[PDB]
Structure formats: structure tokens, C-alpha cells
Amino acid sequence: IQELILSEENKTNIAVLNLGTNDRRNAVLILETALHLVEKYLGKIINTSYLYETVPEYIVVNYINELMQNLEESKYEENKELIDKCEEYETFLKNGKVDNSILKEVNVENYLLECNNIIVKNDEIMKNNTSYFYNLTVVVKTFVNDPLSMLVVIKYIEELMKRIIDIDILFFNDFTIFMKNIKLEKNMIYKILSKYIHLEIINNMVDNIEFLSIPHVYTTHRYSILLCLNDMIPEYKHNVLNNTIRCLYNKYVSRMKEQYNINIKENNKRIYVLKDRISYLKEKTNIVGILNVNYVEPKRAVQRMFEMINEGASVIDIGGESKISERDLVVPVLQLFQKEWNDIKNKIVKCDAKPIISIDTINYNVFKECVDNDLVDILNDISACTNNPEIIKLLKKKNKFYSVVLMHKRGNPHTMDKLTNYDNLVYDIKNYLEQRLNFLVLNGIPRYRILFDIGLGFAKKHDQSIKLLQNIHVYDEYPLFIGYSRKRFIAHCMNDQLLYQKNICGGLAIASYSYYKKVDLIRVHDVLETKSVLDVLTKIDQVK
Amino acid sequence: TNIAVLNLGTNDRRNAVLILETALHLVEKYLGKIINTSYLYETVPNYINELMQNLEESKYEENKELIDKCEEYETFLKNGKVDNSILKEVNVENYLLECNNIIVKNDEIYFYNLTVVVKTFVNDPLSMLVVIKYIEELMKRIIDIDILFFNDFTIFMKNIKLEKNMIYKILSKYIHLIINNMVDNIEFLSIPHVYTTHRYSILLCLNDMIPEYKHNVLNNTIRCLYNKYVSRMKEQYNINIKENNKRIYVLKDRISYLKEKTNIVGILNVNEPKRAVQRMFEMINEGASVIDIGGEISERDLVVPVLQLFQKEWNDAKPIISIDTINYNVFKECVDNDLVDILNDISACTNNPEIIKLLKKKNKFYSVVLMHKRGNPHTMDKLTNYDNLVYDIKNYLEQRLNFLVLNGIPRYRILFDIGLGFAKKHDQSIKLLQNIHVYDEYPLFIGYSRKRFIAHCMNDKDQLLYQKNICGGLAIASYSYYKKVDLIRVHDVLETKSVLDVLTKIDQVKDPNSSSVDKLAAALEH
Ligand SMILES: COc1ncnc(NS(=O)(=O)c2ccc(NCC3=Nc4c(nc(N)[nH]c4=O)NC3)cc2)c1OC
Ligand SMILES: COc1ncnc(NS(=O)(=O)c2ccc(NCC3=Nc4c(nc(N)[nH]c4=O)NC3)cc2)c1OC
Ligand SMILES: Nc1ncnc2c1ncn2[C@@H]1O[C@H](COP(=O)(O)O)[C@@H](O)[C@H]1O
Ligand SMILES: Nc1ncnc2c1ncn2[C@@H]1O[C@H](COP(=O)(O)O)[C@@H](O)[C@H]1O
Ligand SMILES: Nc1nc2c(c(=O)[nH]1)N=C(CO)CN2
Ligand SMILES: [Ca+2]
Ligand SMILES: [Ca+2]
Ligand SMILES: [Mg+2]
Ligand SMILES: [Mg+2]
């Protein structure tokens, strides 16, 4: 019992996990706490799905903050170093030569029978007599020897966090396992946990581990699982599966339309996260108000910030970059705002009226200072983290994750207008942003915290800027952020302060278009004007 | 007194209006009364001034008297007991064989169509064809006028030869008075016309006027025959037939394709004539296609000088001029002095139905905006109970169009306005916009600009509300653009033009399938 499980030969495995909660209000917090415990106790997070609000598929407070300060250390070291490839993961996808399973495997026929046996039994049990699920999948490059050991460590995580959180193993390497009548005595659980954790309870866990199925029994039966896997590993084909995850996903979607007339997408919603709350993808065009700092007037800038809030902005994007350092332009403004917002002698109940703060910077030192001082929520990196990818390390704090805008450009402001050739503009830009996302996600950044920005006017001719807008549908599956405001291409569409006026007016046309295209965020100079447009369009859509 | 259905055709694109409207007058002058018209259609298979002055007078009197019913026309539609045919009438199968015989013989090798209904004093379709061919000759493919129906008669006359003596005495019966080309042209006579059920353009026009008509020859109602052709062109040939067979409305004298452009109508609201003519020029330069002038010291004194000064300064890309009046005498003056092109009647011509008489001259037709409202400015906020808001207003406006059409105002010159903010609560104005698609078949003109409902949608204080209200209007401009509203009446022209331009640009796709092509190319690349 103690020989191959606690074997000193350290290996690198690939595991796929499903994370789920029922707590709508705290979903982000619950799930992201689990994500941290996974980085800490299991290995490295190298892929995530989007977050989903999910229809239940049963049939065929702040102690979390205090837990985070009392965690036992892992026996395995964290490494935040950027990686550009992962060999084990490539092997896992292909899906070939890894180490032999230390747990006994079953063949396909045995797996299928045992799996169906569990499901029929479960459908029957459950036919007895509510709330949405919040789901996420993750890929972990794990130092844990085997899936039973991993299940033990996962149950500990579940215990530490305690329906609040459900963590399941969907895949572990290419293994096919069905062990039926597991009992591990308490000392064996202790021994497993001690291999991985500097232990400082177990009583619960003995009861809880009844059997082990790899793949998870419900992998092919739950839409919510297939929905999450489709984001991460669509080309993947496990031995016990009739097809790739993408094919299984697509067939499920059509099976609901043809056999049931249900569009299964309608009540299973994709979620992105700007700060700490759920946003439904494509459900709201958010206004991002632009705050340019270039003079020094930190008091005037903070007044403008407050003006913008009242004018209707959900997000404030501050930037010094377009003598005195960038840091000295932005940090004092953010420090003043932070003070002035805290010294609100108004309703302390009115504290969920705070705008999300975004910083338009490519510079590590500036972002590092803002983050340490709790001055910002989002990184707006116009180089899509290519100028200094080390910034990606600052998006992960132990309990906390930050969101990030990835924008496309070529060159710098003086070389930009030259670098205009594209073989296939729309798709070049899209694939570029997709590749940039794969890199952050490979490096442990939650997929649902990443925003795509085509970068209008950045190494684009005016016709190319227009064409990217005509073809904006290309981002229908993704969180989309655009900045068209006061850019020169608008003017090029119209048939000196009159020219500045027509430009602002022309932007509001793009605000309308964005609204109808369900653009998630628009970065604008003119907040009041934009808010007024969106309000009217919203009201015309509201059927009473 | 007979009921005659005519088709009128031309192929000159530039002068289609002037060609077909002149033909309309000559029909009015020489044949009876126009009591129905269709829309103008573009379908796919000039000293008229000198002619208008030296025109021969009819043997019948022209009365512009309004009517609200026409019993003969109602009997035509039924189709009940009418006067017996004074000509050789064939039966069902005999007509069908003879019909097929002209079709197969002709099957051996842009079009602008308009149908009309005429209450005619002319005794028979053959006599009418004589007057019709004479009408065609006075105007000389330039204009072709056919007889689609004459009462309920099933007629075929196999070979016709008539002399200068016979033709002169038919043409004398109806006119006080060359016959050279006329003798050679009249070969035969078919009632109904041979191509009635065959050409799409004909069925398209007839569906405007007489959808429930069922001639003894034809196997279904004009609508059911129309609807079959539409569904068969899609199912059989995978072609949307409405793509190349476009509906036309006319604002002045030029063709406008229904639902193809959102025109800006600039508001000139008087109370100083010099300042107001400056604003008109400004508005043209900001991108207004139409100017809407309204004073409503007298209404006439506020507006007629401004229009007269404008007309002059222009003589020292012309905007279409619209007058916002319900006053008969004010419109009459403007129209006699060629100062306006359009009547904007906010009472939908119910304040004074006589105003409709002024939308016609010998050579002129003016267009009109019909707006829905209840009451006056002081009472309207109270008059907000509707059985079915959306449908009561549409039917209301449809009844009004029918009335103007019964009286010979061309169908294609009448514009619909829902009257936002007139006897509508804020939610009802919104509901009306939400349901604007109910006007997909019609020329639609709306005015939201600066009205109170815009403000109600929003979540230095009075100046802020003013600014928000102009900006909120731009959202409605955008909506109007996507919904394909034909005209929008606005205060802020530059702003609205800026918005419409950007939206037009976004919509101009150089290659209509480059979207899927580029997608495939990306999918085929490593
Ligand atoms: C030399 O003068 C010029 N000549 C021709 N075209 C020009 N381009 S432009 O006027 O259209 C223009 C204007 C402003 C910008 N940058 C503003 C930003 N735009 C964004 C941001 N962040 C995010 N995420 N997305 C953004 O779109 N941060 C700042 C870029 C292009 C131009 O200006 C540099
Ligand atoms: C004295 O009465 C009033 N009292 C309080 N608030 C009022 N404000 S309101 O915003 O609801 C509003 C504003 C303007 C109007 N009418 C302007 C016009 N509107 C049109 C037109 N012609 C056409 N064809 N279509 C038009 O919509 N001519 C003039 C109607 C309602 C108000 O109305 C004048
Ligand atoms: N791949 C798996 N991941 C998680 N739990 C599993 C798996 N295979 C079997 N189980 C068992 O399923 C039960 C967990 O159910 P739940 O409490 O709903 O997560 C426990 O008895 C586990 O031992
Ligand atoms: N119902 C009808 N209306 C008009 N013309 C007709 C009719 N029946 C036969 N025709 C003949 O068709 C000729 C005109 O043909 P077209 O102008 O080429 O369509 C006339 O001169 C008539 O002789
Ligand atoms: N949609 C959905 N349904 C479920 C889920 C879940 O995560 N999502 N988890 C279950 C057992 O924990 C039971 N049912
Ligand atoms: Ca780790
Ligand atoms: Ca007459
Ligand atoms: Mg579970
Ligand atoms: Mg003909």
C-alpha cells in the first residue's frame, strides 16, 4: 500500500480538473481561492476555461480571507518564471508516451460498463422530491504521483475551504481507471498529505473517497463539463471517448436543437471578470472613461475621475504615456483618488458604486507600484504583454488575480503608420491576440480575465481600422475591448473645432454600432455623450 | 361610367417621374378620374412644357371635388352587376387558348411601372385604347399604357383594322381637336391584357391597389397570385425577387428607393428673414436633404417671405422644401409661387381635407407627410388611451392614405408619420419606435428631435439635460438608420449627418463574401 504511492521518484503529470460552486455572489472568490490552492498544492496551472453560469445537470463569508493567512506550506516549490512551452502538455494532447500508471487500469469495455452502471444508479437515486452552477476547468502540470493521491489532496483543499466548492478530476494523463471499493485508512491519508504538505480533519476524508473513475464518469454526460473543455482542449481524444472534445461538444449542442428544440447556449452563459464580480459575456456595453495625465495637476485629474463616474463610466483607464517620469504622472493621481474615494463622508453602503481602475502602461515598474499599493484593478497593456512579459507575474498575487487588456499593434508611435501590410488583416490580428492569450493562459492567468483589443489606429490605415470594425463579429466568443475615441480614421469617414465636433459625433455612431454588436467595453473620451446614447438604445431594447 | 385598370410603363430613368406623371394627367384629362394608384417600381424583366400649354380640351368637365366613396369601383371589386359589354365577348377557355397563342408567338427573339384605376366615361376598352394610343402619340418605349382590366369583361378581338374616318369619330366623342402611326399600331384587343398574370411587375403593382380582386379568367385573387410568384422564385430559383424589383417613393421630382437611405430633414422653426435664410444654407451645408419650414403676427408673414427670400438667394443640389402647415391658404400661396415641394400636415389632412386638392395641378404633383396625433398642444398629453397603440395608428394612417389615393394623390407621394410625442406618453413613443417595422412597406418620416420622451430614458442642471437630450437623439438617429427610416426630422443637422456618415461607412462592404472567404483562408493556414 505504501510502496508505489509514496515512491520517491518525482514525476510530472498532466491533470484536468473541474471546479464548481453554487454561490453566485461569491463565485469569483470561491473559484479563484480554489485556483490558488491548486497552484500551491498540486503543481502549475497551464490552462483554464472561461467561467460559466450553468443549468444544473442532475439527471441523464470572509473566513476565506483568514484561511489564506493560515495555510500550511507545500513541500514543492513555487516557480513564477515565464514558460513558452510545456512538453508534458503536448504529449498529453497528442496523446502518447508518458509514464505507466501506478494504479491498475481497465480496458474500454470495462470502463464503459462500470461508468453506465454508476449513471443509471445515480439518475434513479436523484429522482426524489433550483440554483445555477458556477463552473470552471483547469489543466494542471502536477507533481502528484497518481490520481488517487491527487484526489486525497483535493479533498483536503475542499475541507480547508469549508456545496461551497466541488473539485473533480476529469483526466489524468492517458489513464483509464475504475477502482470500485476504495478505503484508505486514516494513517495512509496522513502519509499522502505529508508527502505534499508541511502538515501542522482526516476523519472526514476516509468516508468520502468511495471510488475512483478516470475519466470522470460525468465527463461526456454534462454539457457544463463539455462546455468548459471545449475552451481548453478541443482537439483532445481520450481512449474511452467516441470523438474529440470539440466534436462531442458540437454534437451535444445539435442533439438539444434537433431532438428537443432547446438552444442549450441560452441558459449556460459565458462569464468574464473585470475585477471581482461576474459579467455575462455580451450582456452589457461598458464605458471606459479615458484619463490622460500630461501637464502637474493631481487634484484636477481626480476631479475629472469623479466627474466621469457621475457621467456614467464603469471603468476609468488612466495613462501617462502617449522630462517627468510616467510613475510621477500616474501614481500620485491614483493615490489621491484612492484617498478621496475612501474619505467619502457619503453613504458607506454606497461602496459598490466604485469604478474599476485600469492602467494604460507597458512598464513593469509602474504597474508594480500600483498593484502593491492597491491602486488598480486592470492592466491595459498596448503591447499585449510583449514589451516586458515579466509584467505577467504581477497579474498573480497569492489570493488575487488581476485582469488584463491585450491590444494589437506593430512598432512604436513613429514607426507605426509604415507597418501596414497584412496578408489577412482580420484573421492576422485575431490569431495574434489568440496566441497572446495562449501565452498568458499557459502561464497561469485565468482565461476569463483576458480582454481582446484590435487596437484601432495602431499600424492600421484608416480603411483597415474601418474593416476591423465591419468584421467585429469575429470576436463573438470573446471579451472585447475597443478604443475608437477621437482617432483619425473617424474623420476620414465624414463627407477646426467643427472637425473636432464631427469627430466626437462620429464616435457616437461607433458607440451605437458597438452596442448592437455587443462590444463588452468601449474606451472613450466623451462619457456623458456616450452614456446618453447607450441609455436610449438600451431603453429601445427593453420590451415592457 | 366604367372601371378601367391601366398599366403605365417607361424606361427613361432620369425623367420617369415627369414621364409617368404627365401620362397620369392626360389619363385624368381624357378618360375620367384616377381613384387608385400603385407605388412606382423599378423592375428587371424635354419640351413637355411646350406640349402642356398647347393641349386640346376634353368634351367632359374636370371637377376636383373630394369623394369618400365610389360605388362603381366597389361593384368592380365584388364583382357584381355592371353594364353589359358593348363588344364581342369570348368565354374562359377561348380567351385562354388565344392568350397562350400570343405568348408562344412572342417567345421568339430597367423598367418603370405604375398601375392606376380609372372611373371612366369612355364606353368600351377599344375606344379607350384609341384614346390611350393617341395619348401615347402626343407624348412622342418612352411611354407605354396598357388596359389590364375593363369592368369584368372577358374580351378577345382577333384582328382589328380601322380607318382615319373611324378613329377621328372616336377621338371626337371625347376631345375637341397625327393619326398616321395610330392605324398601324392597333393590331388586337385582349381584356384582361395578355401579360397580366405573367409579368412580375404587373402583379406587383396590382397587389398595391386591388389584392382581393378575382377576375373570372384568373385562377386566384391578385394577392394569392402575387404571393405564389414570390414563394416560387425563392423555392425554384433561389432568388429574392424584391432585390432587383425595388419600390419607389418621390419627394419632389426625383426617384427615391424605399428603405435605401435615411434622409435628414432640417427643422427651420421661425420665431428676422435674413437670419433664417442663413440657417437654411447652413443646414444644406451641414447635410440636410430636406428643409421643413414652419411658423405655426400671422403664419403667412412668418413663413412666405422667408421662402420667397430663399428662392431668390438660391437663384443669386437644391434642397427639397417642406412646409409644416395645416392652413389651406398658406399652402395655396406657397404652391402658386413655387416656394415648396412638400406639405407636412400634422393633422393628416383632417383639419381641412380640402388641402388635398392643392397637391395636384395640370402638370404638378406635390408630396405630403401624414402625421398621427390627437387634440391640440394643450390637451394632447391627456389623450393617451389606445385600444392597440401600434395598430390603431398604422390603420389610422392607412385609412388616410386610402382617402388621398381614392382622390388621385399618387400612392408613391404619401409619407407616414407616427407623430412621436403627440398624444403619446413616453413609454408609448418608445413602443412606437420598438415597433417601427410595421412600416417596412411604406415611406416613413419620423420626428423625435429634442422631444421630452428622450429625456425620460436617461438616469448647469438644465443645460446638461439639454445636451443629454441632443445626444440621446443621436441614438435614435442610429436606430432609425438600422431600421431604414426614410426621413428623420431633426434640429441638429451636423451631428446627425456625422453619425449617419460613420454608420454608412461601416456598412459599405467592398466584398460581400470576403467575411467567409477570409475565414476559410485563415483556417487553411498553419
Ligand atoms: C502622428 O499622428 C497620427 N497620424 C495618423 N494616425 C494616427 N493615429 S490615431 O489618431 O488614429 C491614434 C490616436 C490615438 C492613439 N492612441 C490612443 C490609445 N488607444 C488605445 C489605448 N489602449 C487600448 N487598450 N486601446 C486603444 O485603442 N491607449 C491609448 C492611437 C492612434 C496618429 O496619431 C498617433
Ligand atoms: C405645447 O406643447 C408641449 N408642451 C410640453 N411639452 C411639449 N414637448 S414634446 O417634447 O413632447 C413635443 C415637442 C414638440 C412637438 N412637436 C414638434 C413637431 N413634430 C413633428 C412635426 N411634423 C412632423 N411631421 N412630425 C413631427 O414629429 N412638426 C412639429 C411635439 C411634442 C410640447 O409640445 C410642443
Ligand atoms: N475522477 C474523480 N474525481 C472526483 N471524485 C471521484 C472521481 N472518481 C470517483 N470519485 C468519487 O466520487 C465521490 C465524490 O463525489 P462528490 O462529493 O459529488 O464530489 C467520491 O466518492 C469520490 O471518491
Ligand atoms: N389590353 C390591351 N391593352 C393595350 N394594348 C393591347 C391590349 N391587347 C392587345 N394590345 C395590342 O398590343 C399593342 C401594343 O403592344 P406593346 O405596346 O408592345 O405592349 C397595341 O397596339 C394593341 O394592338
Ligand atoms: N450543471 C451542473 N450540474 C451539476 C454539477 C455542476 O457542476 N454543474 N455538479 C453536480 C455535483 O457536484 C451535480 N450537477
Ligand atoms: Ca505552483
Ligand atoms: Ca378628370
Ligand atoms: Mg464531485
Ligand atoms: Mg404595351
mmCIF file of N, CA and C in Angstrom, chain B residues 38-74:
data_model
loop_
_atom_site.group_PDB
_atom_site.id
_atom_site.type_symbol
_atom_site.label_atom_id
_atom_site.label_comp_id
_atom_site.label_asym_id
_atom_site.label_seq_id
_atom_site.Cartn_x
_atom_site.Cartn_y
_atom_site.Cartn_z
ATOM 1 N N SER B 38 -50.828 52.581 -57.720
ATOM 2 C CA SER B 38 -49.867 51.729 -57.047
ATOM 3 C C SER B 38 -48.633 52.580 -56.712
ATOM 4 N N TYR B 39 -47.654 51.968 -56.044
ATOM 5 C CA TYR B 39 -46.351 52.570 -55.898
ATOM 6 C C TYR B 39 -45.647 52.517 -57.246
ATOM 7 N N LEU B 40 -44.628 53.352 -57.408
ATOM 8 C CA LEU B 40 -43.728 53.271 -58.545
ATOM 9 C C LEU B 40 -42.769 52.094 -58.312
ATOM 10 N N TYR B 41 -42.461 51.357 -59.372
ATOM 11 C CA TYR B 41 -41.485 50.275 -59.275
ATOM 12 C C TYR B 41 -40.443 50.297 -60.381
ATOM 13 N N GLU B 42 -39.188 50.114 -59.987
ATOM 14 C CA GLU B 42 -38.106 49.806 -60.908
ATOM 15 C C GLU B 42 -38.044 48.294 -60.986
ATOM 16 N N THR B 43 -38.258 47.775 -62.190
ATOM 17 C CA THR B 43 -38.329 46.334 -62.425
ATOM 18 C C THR B 43 -37.351 45.865 -63.509
ATOM 19 N N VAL B 44 -36.890 44.625 -63.356
ATOM 20 C CA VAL B 44 -35.967 43.977 -64.298
ATOM 21 C C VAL B 44 -36.662 42.707 -64.842
ATOM 22 N N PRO B 45 -36.858 42.616 -66.190
ATOM 23 C CA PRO B 45 -37.589 41.562 -66.925
ATOM 24 C C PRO B 45 -37.587 40.139 -66.336
ATOM 25 N N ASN B 46 -36.287 68.180 -72.729
ATOM 26 C CA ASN B 46 -37.625 67.614 -72.946
ATOM 27 C C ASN B 46 -38.737 68.670 -72.849
ATOM 28 N N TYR B 47 -39.120 69.218 -74.006
ATOM 29 C CA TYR B 47 -40.225 70.180 -74.069
ATOM 30 C C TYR B 47 -41.599 69.505 -73.929
ATOM 31 N N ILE B 48 -41.841 68.927 -72.747
ATOM 32 C CA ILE B 48 -43.194 68.540 -72.334
ATOM 33 C C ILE B 48 -43.942 69.815 -71.887
ATOM 34 N N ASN B 49 -43.184 70.845 -71.495
ATOM 35 C CA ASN B 49 -43.711 72.185 -71.176
ATOM 36 C C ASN B 49 -44.454 72.828 -72.357
ATOM 37 N N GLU B 50 -43.863 72.719 -73.551
ATOM 38 C CA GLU B 50 -44.466 73.191 -74.806
ATOM 39 C C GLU B 50 -45.746 72.413 -75.116
ATOM 40 N N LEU B 51 -45.724 71.111 -74.823
ATOM 41 C CA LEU B 51 -46.874 70.225 -75.002
ATOM 42 C C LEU B 51 -48.013 70.533 -74.027
ATOM 43 N N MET B 52 -47.668 70.918 -72.796
ATOM 44 C CA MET B 52 -48.652 71.179 -71.730
ATOM 45 C C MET B 52 -49.468 72.462 -71.923
ATOM 46 N N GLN B 53 -48.879 73.438 -72.619
ATOM 47 C CA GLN B 53 -49.521 74.732 -72.901
ATOM 48 C C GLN B 53 -50.505 74.658 -74.074
ATOM 49 N N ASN B 54 -50.123 73.916 -75.116
ATOM 50 C CA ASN B 54 -50.954 73.720 -76.307
ATOM 51 C C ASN B 54 -51.721 72.390 -76.270
ATOM 52 N N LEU B 55 -52.416 72.146 -75.157
ATOM 53 C CA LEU B 55 -53.228 70.939 -75.010
ATOM 54 C C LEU B 55 -54.683 71.157 -75.367
ATOM 55 N N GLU B 56 -55.233 70.191 -76.099
ATOM 56 C CA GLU B 56 -56.633 70.201 -76.514
ATOM 57 C C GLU B 56 -57.538 69.859 -75.342
ATOM 58 N N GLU B 57 -58.711 70.486 -75.313
ATOM 59 C CA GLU B 57 -59.634 70.337 -74.190
ATOM 60 C C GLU B 57 -60.615 69.180 -74.385
ATOM 61 N N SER B 58 -61.009 68.576 -73.266
ATOM 62 C CA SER B 58 -61.880 67.406 -73.251
ATOM 63 C C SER B 58 -63.333 67.809 -73.490
ATOM 64 N N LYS B 59 -64.136 66.843 -73.937
ATOM 65 C CA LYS B 59 -65.587 67.005 -74.066
ATOM 66 C C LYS B 59 -66.312 66.784 -72.733
ATOM 67 N N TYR B 60 -65.550 66.396 -71.712
ATOM 68 C CA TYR B 60 -66.067 66.211 -70.360
ATOM 69 C C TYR B 60 -65.433 67.220 -69.410
ATOM 70 N N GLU B 61 -66.178 67.599 -68.375
ATOM 71 C CA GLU B 61 -65.708 68.595 -67.405
ATOM 72 C C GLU B 61 -64.900 67.960 -66.271
ATOM 73 N N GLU B 62 -63.861 68.687 -65.862
ATOM 74 C CA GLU B 62 -62.951 68.289 -64.797
ATOM 75 C C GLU B 62 -63.407 68.916 -63.483
ATOM 76 N N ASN B 63 -63.882 68.084 -62.553
ATOM 77 C CA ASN B 63 -64.162 68.564 -61.190
ATOM 78 C C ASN B 63 -63.266 67.943 -60.118
ATOM 79 N N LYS B 64 -62.619 68.829 -59.361
ATOM 80 C CA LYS B 64 -61.661 68.460 -58.317
ATOM 81 C C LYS B 64 -62.331 68.116 -56.979
ATOM 82 N N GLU B 65 -63.663 67.997 -56.987
ATOM 83 C CA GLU B 65 -64.463 67.706 -55.789
ATOM 84 C C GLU B 65 -64.010 66.428 -55.093
ATOM 85 N N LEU B 66 -63.823 66.520 -53.782
ATOM 86 C CA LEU B 66 -63.449 65.364 -52.982
ATOM 87 C C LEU B 66 -64.560 64.329 -52.886
ATOM 88 N N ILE B 67 -64.167 63.076 -52.706
ATOM 89 C CA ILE B 67 -65.107 61.965 -52.583
ATOM 90 C C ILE B 67 -64.606 61.067 -51.467
ATOM 91 N N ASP B 68 -65.515 60.329 -50.838
ATOM 92 C CA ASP B 68 -65.166 59.424 -49.740
ATOM 93 C C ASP B 68 -65.582 57.983 -50.038
ATOM 94 N N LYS B 69 -66.321 57.820 -51.138
ATOM 95 C CA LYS B 69 -66.748 56.520 -51.650
ATOM 96 C C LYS B 69 -66.890 56.585 -53.168
ATOM 97 N N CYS B 70 -66.825 55.422 -53.811
ATOM 98 C CA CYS B 70 -67.095 55.295 -55.239
ATOM 99 C C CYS B 70 -67.768 53.953 -55.513
ATOM 100 N N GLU B 71 -69.083 54.002 -55.729
ATOM 101 C CA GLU B 71 -69.916 52.791 -55.776
ATOM 102 C C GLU B 71 -69.610 51.870 -56.950
ATOM 103 N N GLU B 72 -69.315 52.454 -58.111
ATOM 104 C CA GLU B 72 -68.979 51.682 -59.310
ATOM 105 C C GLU B 72 -67.723 50.849 -59.084
ATOM 106 N N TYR B 73 -66.711 51.495 -58.493
ATOM 107 C CA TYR B 73 -65.449 50.872 -58.097
ATOM 108 C C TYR B 73 -65.673 49.736 -57.114
ATOM 109 N N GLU B 74 -66.566 49.953 -56.143
ATOM 110 C CA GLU B 74 -66.928 48.920 -55.155
ATOM 111 C C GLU B 74 -67.634 47.707 -55.783
#
